Every structure is written in C-alpha cells, then in structure tokens.
C-alpha cells in the first residue's frame, strides 16, 4: 500500500509537470500574438 | 408602397368587408388572385418571412381541424397530436430536419412512449427483446447505436494498448511503472525486466 | 433459444470473418499478409457479389447509415401494437412505411412544419377525398372548432401588406384614397379578421334565429355543450386568466 | 502497451524499435540472414483464436482475439499513427531540411497503405421503401442462407432473382480512410508552401 | 492552336478511323476499357467522368440508371462497330410534384423500357395512360393504380424517328370520372453514334471541359443554341467565350450569362442543384401548385389576363409589375405585343430583356428610355441573331 | 490615399490580435474538453 | 514639424512595448523548449 | 510570376509525354513518377532545395522503398549491411548521421 501510493505521487508529479509546461505554450503563443500585434502597430504608425 | 398597379389597388379596394349593396361578395379565387398580386411585388426575404408565417398559422388551422374531426377520440389538444402522429406541429419553421432523421425521431418517441407503457395495450413480448433490453444504452439514438455496429465490424478503432477488459495484475504494474513524462531506455527495460 | 442464438451468434461472426478480410483498403497495402477467409467465393456465389461492393461513409447503402439504423428501429418497433390497433405505426403514420431510403431523403435540409403541415394536409385531404384547394376553400369557412375559419389567400395577403406597409403609413398619408378604404377592413388588414369570421361577428342574433345559428357556429343544440372551465378554455385556447 | 506510452511522451526512436518486436515491414534477420515472415507475434501469422464466445460484451478486444486480424490492423494503424507524428513533429519546425524529413515521413506512410479504393466503391443502391428493407422475412432469408453458407449446400444451381437485394452494404472504416485523407492534405500542404 | 485543331475539326464516318489514330494512337474503341482509364488519361475525378459517362454497367444492382440525367448505351453486334446510345432526360412539367424518376431505357431496336417511381400515390384515378405530347397513347392501362415509391417496368415500342427527335413521354393518371387528371411529363432525346466517332466527340468535349472549366451540359446548352447533332464549331467558342465574358465583366452567374448568349432558360436539374428554371419560377412555390411551360395563350396587356397564377409567377419571378411586364414583352418586340404563349422560348427573351436592365444597372423603365433613344428603338430582339 | 491605407493597417494589427484569442480558445477548450488525464486518472486509481 | 516629432516619440513607445514583448516569448519559449529540469528528471528517477 | 507559372505547367506537359512514351511500363500516374525517378513532379515552384539536397532525399527515398520491398527485386543479403541496420535510428536523416 506504502509502494502504490508512492507511485501515486510520482504520477501525481509528472502530471503537474505536463500542466506546467501546457500552461507554458499558452504564455508562449500569447508572447507570440502580441508581439505580431505590435509590429502590425508599427505598420500602421509608419502609414501615419 | 405595395409593391403593385394601381388597378391592384382598385382589385384590394374591391375586396371591401361592408360596402354599397348590389355588389357581390369576394369569392376564394378573387382573394386568391389578390393574394398572388400582393406576393408577387415581394423580394426574397420578404416572401421566405411569408412562407414562414403561412406554414406557422396553416398549422394551428389544420391541426386544430384535425383533432376536431378526423383523429381519435383521445386526441384532445396539439400536444397530444404531438404524441399521437409522432411530429410536432407546434415546432416553429426556422427548425430543419431531414426525412430520414424526422422518421428515426418519430419511432424512437414510439418506442419511449411504447416501454413506459403510456399507449393503448403495448405487446409485452415485444418488450424483452434483444434490441429494447439494449434499448436504454445504445439502441436509444443513432450515434451509440452506430458506435456498438462499428465496434462490432472494427474493432480497430477502439483498441487502445493501455486499458483492456481482463488484463492481468502485472500488464497494469507495468502500466503503473511506466506512466511518467520522462521514459529513458534504460526505465523501460527496468520495467520490463521487473 | 440457446441453440438458435449460438447459431445467430455464429452466423454473425462468420459474417464478420468473411467481410473483414474483403476490405478493400487492406488489398493494396505492403507486407500486412491477410489471407482471404477461404469462404469470400462462397459469400460472393450466395450473396451476389455483396462481399465485392463496398461503400464509402456517409452513404444512404451503408450498413452504418441512419437509414440502416432507421431500418432497424421499424423492424424492431412495428410489433407493439396489433395492426388493428389505431397506435400502429401503419395506422398513425402510414407513411413512414413507404419511405423511399434514397440518398436525398438522408441529406436534404428541409423544414420540421413543412413534414408536419404534409401529414396534416394529407390526412386532411384524404378525408375529405379533395384537392389541396378544395381543402383550403372549405378551412376558409369552417366555423365548427375555435381558431378557425381560416382564409389563406386572405392570411397571405394581409402579411404581404404588413410586410410592405407596417404601421399602415399609406392610410396615414395619402387621404384622399383613404376616403375609399373601410376602416373594418382596415381592421381586417392590420389583424386578423377573415371574411367568414367577419361574417360570424356581423351577423345579428335574435331568439328566432339562434338556434340555426348555434348550428352554423357549433354543431348541436343544448347549450351544455363545453360543461367546464377547460373544455372553454380549450375549444378556443384561451388561459384560466383569460377565460 | 509500451509502444503507445513511448508516442504519448514523443520518444521517437524507441517507439519504432518497441514496434518493430511486432511488426517489421522490412523483414526480420534471424541468425545475420532476412527471414519470409514480417510478424514477430506467431499467434498473428496464423490466425489463432484466443477467444470463443467474443460477443457476450461490447468488447473490441475479445472480438479481436476472436480474430487477431483486427490486432493486425491495430498495428498497422498504430504505425501510421507514428508516421504522421513524425512528419508532423518535422513539419512544425518549419526548416527546409524538415521539410524533407516530413515529406519523406508521409511518402512512407502513403506507400505502406498503397492506393486509396476510389473506384472500386459502390455508388450504387437499389432504393427500396423502408418497408421493403424492413422485412422480416428477407431477414430470415438471409440468415438461412447464411447457415446454408456455412453449411456448404452444394449451391442449388436453380437460379432464381436476389430476393436480398433491399440489404445495407458493408462500409469501409473511418479511421482509414481518415489517414488517407490527412496524408493527401499534408503532401498538399508540403507540395506548396503552406 | 493545336487544341484548336482537336477541336475544330468535323468528324465523318469516312474520317473517323483517320482523326482516331491522329487523336489516340491505334484504331478498335476498346482503348480505355474502365473508367479509371479513362480518369487517368485525362485526369478527371469520378464526379467530374460521370458528367460525360455512365455506360450500362452495373444496372442489376439499382433501379435508376441515369446519372446527370444521361446515359449511354453501347450496343455490341451491330457489325463489330459497337455503336453508342446516348439518351438524355431533360425532366419537364410537373415532374417533381409528382414522381420519383422517370427513365427511358433501350432494350433492343426499337424495343423500350419506361422505368418511373411515383410520388405520392393516387388511389380514386385507376387510368394510367401515357402519350408523347398529344399525338398518341403508347401505352395505357385500364385499372391500374401504381403505388408510391415502387419501381415499375413498362415495355414501350418508340421508332428511331420519335426518339432521336425530341419525345416527351407524358404519365397520365386519369380517372374514369370526368373530374381532374393528373399530369407528369418528362422529356427524352437519343443520340446514335459509332464507337469511333463517339470517343472523338468525348475527346474534345472533355479537351474542352478542362480548356474552359466549363460544365459539360453550359457547353451542351451553347452546342444546342447554336447547332444540332453536336458539331463543336468555331461559333461554339466564340459564343463560349462570351458566357465566360459576361459571367466574369457583370456578376452574374453560369445560365444568367446563358440566356444573355441567346440560350434558353435551363431546366436542366440535378440531384446536386436545381435547375435555372425551377430556381427561377419554383423556389417558392406560390400557392401550393407549380409552374409549367406549357403553350398557354396570355395577353400580357396589364388589365385583360385574369391569369394570375401565370402572370403572378412572372412578376415575381422577373421583379416586374403588370404595366412593366408589359413594357417588358413590348422592347422584345419592338413596342408591339403579338401572342404571349407562354413557352419556354417566351420565358427566356422576356427575362433577356430584365437581364439587359439588370446587369446595366437601368430599370426596365430607365432601359425603355435609353432604347427609345437608342438607334434600337423599334427594332425587335426577338429576331435577333446572336451578333445583333 | 494614405488614411484608406493606415485603415488597412489597422485591421491586419487587429486580425493579428484574433489571431491569438483564436489560439487561447483553442488551448483552454482542448483543456477542458479533457476533466482529467490518463496519468491523473490512474494516480486517481492508485490512491483508490 | 511637432506633429511629425509626436508620430516618432510614439514609434519609440511601441518598439519599447515590443522589446518586452520579445523578452517574453524567449522567456517563454525557454522554458517551453525544456519539458523538465534536471532535478525535475531526477525526482522521477528517485520516486520510481 | 511568369517563369514560376511555366514551370508548373512544363512539369505537367513533360511528365504526361513521359509516363505515355519512355517510361517503364509500371509507370501509369505522377506519383508514380515520382515514386520512380525519385523527384517531385507535382512540387510548386516555390519550394527550394540545394542539389546535394535534393540527391540525398532522392537516395532517402530510394533505401526506403528498398527496404519495405516496395521495389522489383531488392538484393535481401545487402538489407543487413550495418549501414542499414543503423539506418532507422542514424542513417536516415543526415542529422542524426
């Protein structure tokens, strides 16, 4: 029982790990879309 | 502004309830000739909203005249003929089905109305079969039902290697063993030499 | 019964051996060695070149279609009820016996309430032994049940207007040909009034008259012909707050 | 088991090699010489039956060791599950020497399956009303025929018309054909530069 | 330019077995035998063959053998030539209100086999007969109700004449009462061609289908305005380009730009998309019956019709008034008003006319005034020609 | 002329910006169309 | 002449915005690009 | 623009009158073609490659056709050379190489 729970923690650890990074490439794409965002801004200054 | 000749105003005029005597009344074809003038000074959006309306009001006419005269004695309101020819008229026109689809809903509240046993003298019998004990889980809509005959013919596509009826104590410690972000070589034989 | 489903159960299986070995996307493919089930030639010769004909999803012919499932569910559903029965399928719905399983009636979008105005309309029209028009022409006039008279060509010409002219602004302007224009019939364009409802609501009632007139507008004589407060509310359907 | 947990977590290089303990297209070499056969699992060579009774439950596995030919397909889908995740991994990289990698990933998915059956398919039903193939009878027909199938019956030879002609026909699988179509989408895309 | 010669050329039964070893290599027609040779030789799709092919083949396993209301029919023995049959259903009056299908299939020579699905069976009528066009009964049958949705089989006797003309079988379900009788009617056309010249002609129609991008049954509809007997001409390609001049310079779509090439309105449909001619009169049907062309006399002047189902169905299917439908028959005519018989040939060229105010952005009133002012002002655009 | 193209550039900056609440709703629905994982479901049978 | 002077002091302010944009999407991509640490690694390795 | 569009319309011009006159037999489709003279006939104009490149993808394509015996008669002794039994791990790619 000690060893099934052990395991437990360890897959309770790496699932919380694949969280992190999923949560990672959301930032990731939200730096990404931003960026384009501001350099579309620039365009649009360079027109003005 | 309606869309016509000004004779098809004179024909609408003479379309008047209560006027001077020794005029006839309206027959059904010269309110029909007026109804054709008026729709035909219509666009397209106009006469689909048209059709719409004339679907929604012919069917609270001959629903009502239906349940009125032919039809069972049992029938007494809309929601009952609902329950008696299996479609409902009280649906509005923007819902769209198709016929196979329509038929495939009629029988399956056939069949729900037919195990609770809320119509005339159901075959009992006819209860216990093998498609109505399956009835509940799979046999209720199309999609379990196409799920059971797809699994029957392929099996296939629903193998997954990770879970299956009966596996062993061992083929699930290895699962356990195995069930991490980080798989080196050197875990996975570990694993499968313990 | 344990003999006869071992022998379905066997039947199907091999059914299964037989066609799961003649698919046609496993025919082409590179070192996945299938050997046919040494019975294809005999499920083509008994069952004429079925094992041979293969369909692609989606179609009206497969075994997996909604009109397979369809099929399946008459099969199964049409034993409820005796066929002298009036909750028979054939007898409720004798058209969805005699529904052709084409490709169209599985894909084409049409309207609910345009299935349910054709039933009705048919059984209508099977009942009275008429055509469509003959039906509207006497739904035009009948004054047995509440909501109804029903005067279609007036229904669909008093909603072109409402279409055309909302608010009736043309009344309002042009004056001098709205001298010509009855205000009851205005009333009549603006909501709905028929023709034979105009005249349900015109005619005078005298007690020499009204027992011909409760003939014209219900049926019977004898005055208890509702007996409570719902068959009123019902017969015209109306609320208890509006009754 | 450990073929899907080693996609599941992309490593690659064991997924193909815990594979090919299966299954090899390329052949096995026993003893430095290539060997005939291209399983490495016996009961999959000859079609062993583990399991009698196999629809007693909605079980695709006991179906599939009824017949451990839809193991067989499994595995082949398997491995072009890893061949998509391969090209698509290359082909996220958006690097022209990954360009090649996922093309080259999806030509060798598209010649293990072969040719797509395009006209080898139907198009082709005999349209009956739903009472036609709802018949009892013709169901009856065609489990008789089916025992007398089984049976072998010497084939009657007294030609008569196909009284079974209102059947459903039988489907090629989604999952297949879904691969066929998301290979011809990627080589579309790689084709040009999408 | 070569292309131009493929399709330029006529094709005689002397020059036949010549333009096949110019066109394909060897002579003897079996030089496809399947239809993905015939696919991988042009590349086609399925879809895109079976605009131009459905041989006889396997009709055991269905009940219509049409596919885009077409189907070709080679005959073998008939002195080792393998001449084809081409029949084409053109689906007129009341065909959808009342049946399924409605197929026309050769047996023999002159030997037929009428196939139809009714739709929505009429129990109190018993009388089924069946003419072509008011000339003669070809078959009729006494006491016989035929069920819905049921594929029936009637062996039918049409001469070569009847057929490669124009037939239009006519379904007549009667009854023995004096009271109405129900029409459905549907027209058929055969074309008779050797194997030689047959694979010639698909040649260049499907050359052009894949110069052009253009629908196999627009160009058969551009060859039938101009031509019979399917002569792909110089004429054909310049009026070609003038459909896809017009569909392209206005916005206007595929038979719009037809009837503007002195086409006719189509009543070509298909299970895919309905035809010009339903999409036009019969989206909405109007109330409850439908729309056909048939030859009825009506004076289009906007007080003396009493019509107004017809005439209805015009304005609203032309976005005209009374007055303005009459202007509209008076520019095609050059101000007069002769006999509106309401056929299709009347159809289109009271709906040129609407298309010429349309695409110009004029009202049919404004088109009225430019035309009187025009050098066309009493000239009539019924008698034009497709250059005028 | 320049004004009509300041407008142009002005609407790529905002599809560049419907670009990323594409992405965001694409990743928090495939995360939540998945309640648990395979590892948390079976560190949910370990503790079990 | 100030006006011109106001469209280049905003173009500063954007290409700032999109310095820090960048800053973190290789933050982000970083950390995205190693999907555990080496001590994450190795608690799985001591938990196993 | 102009050069790009030629060049998509020579591949097909040039690969019909291929598979139709010398070719071998086998040969019926474009992807056929491809399969056999180990480029792509069917790329768009677009897309670049080196020539080392793009004769290390033809050869790539050619053991991988090899080894799944996709081929006419491939020589089994060679299939077991080191090269290629340390082909799908490190010799596939030149990277891993």
Same mark, same amino acid.
């Given at each position: 029982?000690?060893?099934?729970?052990?395991?437990?923690?360890?897959?309770?650890?790496?699932?919380?790990?694949? $969280?992190?990074?999923? %949560?990672? #490439? /959301?930032? $990731?794409?939200?730096? %990404?879309? #931003? /960026?384009?965002?501001?350099?579309?801004?620039?365009?649009?200054?360079?027109?003005? | 502004?309606?869309?016509?000749?000004?004779?098809?105003?004179?024909?609408?005029?003479?379309?008047?309830?209560?006027?001077?005597?020794?005029?006839?009344?309206?027959?059904?074809?010269?309110?029909?000739?007026?109804?054709?003038?008026?729709?035909?000074?219509?666009?397209?959006?106009?006469?689909?909203?048209?059709?719409?309306?004339?679907?929604?009001?012919?069917?609270?006419?001959?629903?009502?005249?239906?349940?009125?005269?032919?039809?069972?004695?049992?029938?007494?309101?809309?929601?009952?003929?609902?329950?008696?020819?299996?479609?409902?008229?009280?649906?509005?026109?923007?819902?769209?089905?198709?016929?196979?689809?329509?038929?495939?809903?009629?029988?399956?509240?056939?069949?729900?109305?037919?195990?609770?046993?809320?119509?005339?003298?159901?075959?009992?019998?006819?209860?216990?079969?093998?498609?109505?004990?399956?009835?509940?889980?799979?046999?209720?809509?199309?999609?379990?039902?196409?799920?059971?005959?797809?699994?029957?013919?392929?099996?296939?596509?629903?193998?997954?290697?990770?879970?299956?009826?009966?596996?062993?104590?061992?083929?699930?410690?290895?699962?356990?063993?195995?069930?991490?972000?980080?798989?080196?070589?050197?875990?996975?034989?570990?694993?499968?030499?313990? | 019964?344990?003999?006869?489903?071992?022998?379905?159960?066997?039947?199907?299986?091999?059914?299964?051996?037989?066609?799961?070995?003649?698919?046609?996307?496993?025919?082409?493919?590179?070192?996945?060695?299938?050997?046919?089930?040494?019975?294809?030639?005999?499920?083509?010769?008994?069952?004429?070149?079925?094992?041979?004909?293969?369909?692609?999803?989606?179609?009206?012919?497969?075994?997996?279609?909604?009109?397979?499932?369809?099929?399946?569910?008459?099969?199964?559903?049409?034993?409820?009820?005796?066929?002298?029965?009036?909750?028979?399928?054939?007898?409720?719905?004798?058209?969805?016996?005699?529904?052709?399983?084409?490709?169209?009636?599985?894909?084409?979008?049409?309207?609910?309430?345009?299935?349910?105005?054709?039933?009705?309309?048919?059984?209508?029209?099977?009942?009275?032994?008429?055509?469509?028009?003959?039906?509207?022409?006497?739904?035009?006039?009948?004054?047995?049940?509440?909501?109804?008279?029903?005067?279609?060509?007036?229904?669909?010409?008093?909603?072109?207007?409402?279409?055309?002219?909302?608010?009736?602004?043309?009344?309002?302007?042009?004056?001098?040909?709205?001298?010509?224009?009855?205000?009851?019939?205005?009333?009549?364009?603006?909501?709905?009034?028929?023709?034979?409802?105009?005249?349900?609501?015109?005619?005078?009632?005298?007690?020499?008259?009204?027992?011909?007139?409760?003939?014209?507008?219900?049926?019977?004589?004898?005055?208890?012909?509702?007996?409570?407060?719902?068959?009123?509310?019902?017969?015209?359907?109306?609320?208890?707050?509006?009754? | 088991?450990?073929?899907?947990?080693?996609?599941?977590?992309?490593?690659?290089?064991?997924?193909?090699?815990?594979?090919?303990?299966?299954?090899?297209?390329?052949?096995?070499?026993?003893?430095?010489?290539?060997?005939?056969?291209?399983?490495?699992?016996?009961?999959?060579?000859?079609?062993?039956?583990?399991?009698?009774?196999?629809?007693?439950?909605?079980?695709?596995?006991?179906?599939?060791?009824?017949?451990?030919?839809?193991?067989?397909?499994?595995?082949?889908?398997?491995?072009?599950?890893?061949?998509?995740?391969?090209?698509?991994?290359?082909?996220?990289?958006?690097?022209?020497?990954?360009?090649?990698?996922?093309?080259?990933?999806?030509?060798?998915?598209?010649?293990?399956?072969?040719?797509?059956?395009?006209?080898?398919?139907?198009?082709?039903?005999?349209?009956?009303?739903?009472?036609?193939?709802?018949?009892?009878?013709?169901?009856?027909?065609?489990?008789?025929?089916?025992?007398?199938?089984?049976?072998?019956?010497?084939?009657?030879?007294?030609?008569?018309?196909?009284?079974?002609?209102?059947?459903?026909?039988?489907?090629?699988?989604?999952?297949?054909?879904?691969?066929?179509?998301?290979?011809?989408?990627?080589?579309?895309?790689?084709?040009?530069?999408? | 330019?070569?292309?131009?010669?493929?399709?330029?050329?006529?094709?005689?039964?002397?020059?036949?077995?010549?333009?096949?070893?110019?066109?394909?290599?060897?002579?003897?027609?079996?030089?496809?035998?399947?239809?993905?040779?015939?696919?991988?030789?042009?590349?086609?799709?399925?879809?895109?063959?079976?605009?131009?092919?459905?041989?006889?083949?396997?009709?055991?396993?269905?009940?219509?053998?049409?596919?885009?209301?077409?189907?070709?029919?080679?005959?073998?023995?008939?002195?080792?030539?393998?001449?084809?049959?081409?029949?084409?259903?053109?689906?007129?009056?009341?065909?959808?209100?009342?049946?399924?299908?409605?197929?026309?299939?050769?047996?023999?020579?002159?030997?037929?086999?009428?196939?139809?699905?009714?739709?929505?069976?009429?129990?109190?009528?018993?009388?089924?007969?069946?003419?072509?066009?008011?000339?003669?009964?070809?078959?009729?049958?006494?006491?016989?109700?035929?069920?819905?949705?049921?594929?029936?089989?009637?062996?039918?006797?049409?001469?070569?004449?009847?057929?490669?003309?124009?037939?239009?079988?006519?379904?007549?379900?009667?009854?023995?009462?004096?009271?109405?009788?129900?029409?459905?009617?549907?027209?058929?056309?055969?074309?008779?061609?050797?194997?030689?010249?047959?694979?010639?002609?698909?040649?260049?129609?499907?050359?052009?289908?894949?110069?052009?991008?253009?629908?196999?049954?627009?160009?058969?509809?551009?060859?039938?305005?101009?031509?019979?007997?399917?002569?792909?001409?110089?004429?054909?390609?310049?009026?070609?380009?003038?459909?896809?001049?017009?569909?392209?310079?206005?916005?206007?779509?595929?038979?719009?730009?037809?009837?503007?090439?002195?086409?006719?309105?189509?009543?070509?449909?298909?299970?895919?998309?309905?035809?010009?001619?339903?999409?036009?009169?019969?989206?909405?049907?109007?109330?409850?019956?439908?729309?056909?062309?048939?030859?009825?006399?009506?004076?289009?002047?906007?007080?003396?019709?009493?019509?107004?189902?017809?005439?209805?169905?015009?304005?609203?299917?032309?976005?005209?008034?009374?007055?303005?439908?009459?202007?509209?028959?008076?520019?095609?005519?050059?101000?007069?008003?002769?006999?509106?018989?309401?056929?299709?040939?009347?159809?289109?060229?009271?709906?040129?006319?609407?298309?010429?105010?349309?695409?110009?952005?004029?009202?049919?009133?404004?088109?009225?005034?430019?035309?009187?002012?025009?050098?066309?002002?009493?000239?009539?655009?019924?008698?034009?020609?497709?250059?005028? | 002329?320049?004004?009509?193209?300041?407008?142009?550039?002005?609407?790529?900056?905002?599809?560049?910006?419907?670009?990323?609440?594409?992405?965001?709703?694409?990743?928090?629905?495939?995360?939540?169309?998945?309640?648990?994982?395979?590892?948390?479901?079976?560190?949910?049978?370990?503790?079990?």
């Amino acid at each position: 029982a000690s060893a099934t729970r052990i395991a437990a923690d360890k897959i309770s650890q790496s699932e919380i790990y694949r $969280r992190r990074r999923q %949560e990672w #490439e /959301i930032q $990731r794409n939200n730096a %990404e879309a #931003e /960026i384009k965002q501001i350099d579309a801004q620039l365009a649009t200054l360079a027109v003005r | 502004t309606l869309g016509i000749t000004p004779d098809g105003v004179a024909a609408l005029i003479k379309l008047k309830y209560v006027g001077e005597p020794e005029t006839p009344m309206p027959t059904f074809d010269d309110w029909q000739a007026a109804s054709t003038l008026l729709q035909a000074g219509l666009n397209s959006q106009q006469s689909d909203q048209l059709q719409a309306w004339l679907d929604e009001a012919t069917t609270t006419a001959a629903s009502a005249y239906y349940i009125k005269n032919g039809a069972p004695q049992q029938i007494k309101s809309r929601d009952e003929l609902y329950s008696y020819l299996l479609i409902d008229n009280q649906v509005s026109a923007q819902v769209k089905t198709t016929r196979v689809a329509e038929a495939i809903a009629s029988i399956q509240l056939y069949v729900n109305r037919a195990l609770n046993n809320v119509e005339g003298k159901v075959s009992k019998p006819v209860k216990t079969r093998q498609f109505f004990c399956d009835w509940e889980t799979y046999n209720r809509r199309y999609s379990t039902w196409a799920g059971v005959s797809e699994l029957a013919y392929y099996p296939e596509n629903y193998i997954d290697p990770t879970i299956r009826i009966g596996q062993t104590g061992m083929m699930n410690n290895l699962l356990q063993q195995l069930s991490q972000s980080q798989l080196n070589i050197d875990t996975v034989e570990d694993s499968f030499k313990n | 019964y344990q003999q006869a489903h071992q022998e379905s159960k066997q039947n199907k299986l091999e059914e299964l051996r037989i066609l799961s070995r003649a698919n046609p996307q496993l025919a082409n493919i590179t070192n996945l060695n299938i050997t046919p089930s040494t019975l294809n030639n005999s499920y083509n010769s008994w069952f004429y070149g079925r094992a041979h004909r293969f369909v692609k999803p989606g179609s009206i012919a497969s075994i997996f279609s909604p009109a397979a499932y369809l099929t399946e569910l008459y099969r199964e559903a049409k034993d409820f009820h005796p066929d002298n029965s009036q909750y028979h399928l054939n007898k409720r719905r004798p058209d969805i016996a005699s529904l052709a399983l084409t490709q169209n009636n599985m894909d084409e979008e049409i309207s609910t309430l345009s299935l349910s105005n054709e039933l009705l309309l048919h059984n209508i029209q099977t009942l009275e032994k008429t055509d469509y028009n003959g039906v509207m022409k006497m739904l035009s006039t009948y004054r047995q049940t509440g909501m109804t008279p029903y005067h279609l060509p007036y229904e669909s010409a008093r909603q072109a207007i409402l279409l055309q002219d909302k608010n009736l602004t043309a009344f309002s302007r042009n004056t001098d040909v709205a001298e010509l224009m009855d205000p009851t019939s205005l009333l009549a364009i603006k909501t709905d009034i028929s023709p034979e409802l105009y005249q349900i609501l015109v005619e005078e009632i005298t007690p020499e008259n009204s027992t011909e007139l409760m003939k014209k507008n219900f049926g019977t004589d004898d005055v208890l012909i509702f007996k409570s407060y719902a068959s009123l509310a019902r017969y015209y359907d109306l609320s208890y707050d509006e009754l | 088991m450990v073929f899907q947990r080693l996609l599941q977590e992309q490593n690659f290089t064991e997924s193909t090699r815990w594979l090919r303990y299966i299954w090899n297209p390329a052949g096995y070499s026993v003893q430095g010489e290539m060997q005939d056969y291209y399983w490495n699992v016996r009961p999959l060579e000859e079609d062993t039956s583990w399991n009698a009774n196999p629809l007693d439950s909605v079980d695709p596995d006991a179906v599939a060791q009824h017949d451990p030919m839809h193991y067989k397909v499994a595995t082949f889908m398997k491995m072009l599950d890893l061949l998509i995740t391969r090209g698509d991994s290359a082909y996220r990289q958006l690097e022209r020497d990954t360009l090649n990698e996922a093309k080259m990933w999806y030509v060798q998915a598209l010649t293990l399956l072969g040719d797509e059956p395009y006209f080898s398919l139907d198009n082709d039903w005999s349209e009956p009303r739903l009472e036609e193939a709802a018949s009892q009878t013709m169901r009856h027909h065609y489990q008789h025929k089916m025992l007398q199938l089984r049976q072998r019956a010497a084939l009657p030879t007294k030609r008569t018309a196909n009284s079974l002609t209102a059947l459903f026909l039988p489907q090629i699988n989604k999952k297949l054909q879904g691969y066929w179509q998301t290979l011809t989408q990627r080589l579309y895309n790689l084709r040009h530069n999408l | 330019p070569e292309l131009y010669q493929i399709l330029v050329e006529e094709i005689t039964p002397e020059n036949s077995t010549e333009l096949m070893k110019k066109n394909f290599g060897t002579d003897d027609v079996l030089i496809f035998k399947s239809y993905a040779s015939l696919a991988r030789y042009y590349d086609l799709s399925y879809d895109e063959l079976s605009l131009f092919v459905n041989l006889s083949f396997g009709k055991k396993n269905t009940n219509q053998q049409y596919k885009n209301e077409q189907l070709i029919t080679l005959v073998n023995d008939g002195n080792d030539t393998a001449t084809a049959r081409l029949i084409k259903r053109t689906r007129k009056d009341f065909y959808d209100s009342h049946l399924n299908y409605a197929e026309l299939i050769p047996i023999k020579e002159n030997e037929y086999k009428y196939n139809f699905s009714v739709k929505k069976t009429e129990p109190d009528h018993l009388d089924f007969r069946l003419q072509n066009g008011d000339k003669e009964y070809i078959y009729q049958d006494k006491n016989f109700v035929p069920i819905a949705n049921t594929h029936y089989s009637i062996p039918i006797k049409l001469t070569t004449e009847q057929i490669t003309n124009g037939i239009t079988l006519r379904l007549w379900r009667v009854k023995p009462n004096p009271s109405d009788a129900i029409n459905a009617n549907a027209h058929f056309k055969m074309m008779e061609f050797p194997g030689d010249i047959f694979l010639l002609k698909l040649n260049k129609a499907i050359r052009l289908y894949k110069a052009t991008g253009i629908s196999p049954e627009d160009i058969w509809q551009v060859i039938e305005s101009i031509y019979d007997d399917l002569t792909i001409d110089s004429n054909v390609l310049g009026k070609l380009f003038y459909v896809q001049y017009y569909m392209q310079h206005y916005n206007i779509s595929v038979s719009d730009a037809l009837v503007l090439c002195h086409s006719d309105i189509s009543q070509y449909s298909t299970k895919q998309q309905p035809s010009h001619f339903t999409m036009l009169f019969n989206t909405p049907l109007l109330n409850g019956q439908e729309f056909s062309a048939d030859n009825t006399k009506l004076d289009l002047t906007p007080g003396e019709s009493k019509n107004h189902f017809y005439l209805g169905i015009m304005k609203r299917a032309f976005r005209v008034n009374d007055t303005e439908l009459y202007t509209l028959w008076k520019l095609a005519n050059g101000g007069t008003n002769p006999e509106f018989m309401c056929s299709i040939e009347n159809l289109s060229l009271l709906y040129r006319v609407r298309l010429l105010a349309d695409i110009h952005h004029l009202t049919v009133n404004e088109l009225s005034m430019l035309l009187s002012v025009s050098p066309y002002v009493n000239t009539k655009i019924a008698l034009f020609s497709d250059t005028a | 002329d320049k004004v009509m193209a300041e407008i142009d550039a002005d609407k790529l900056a905002l599809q560049e910006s419907r670009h990323g609440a594409q992405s965001r709703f694409d990743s928090f629905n495939t995360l939540y169309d998945e309640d648990v994982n395979a590892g948390e479901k079976q560190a949910m049978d370990l503790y079990l």
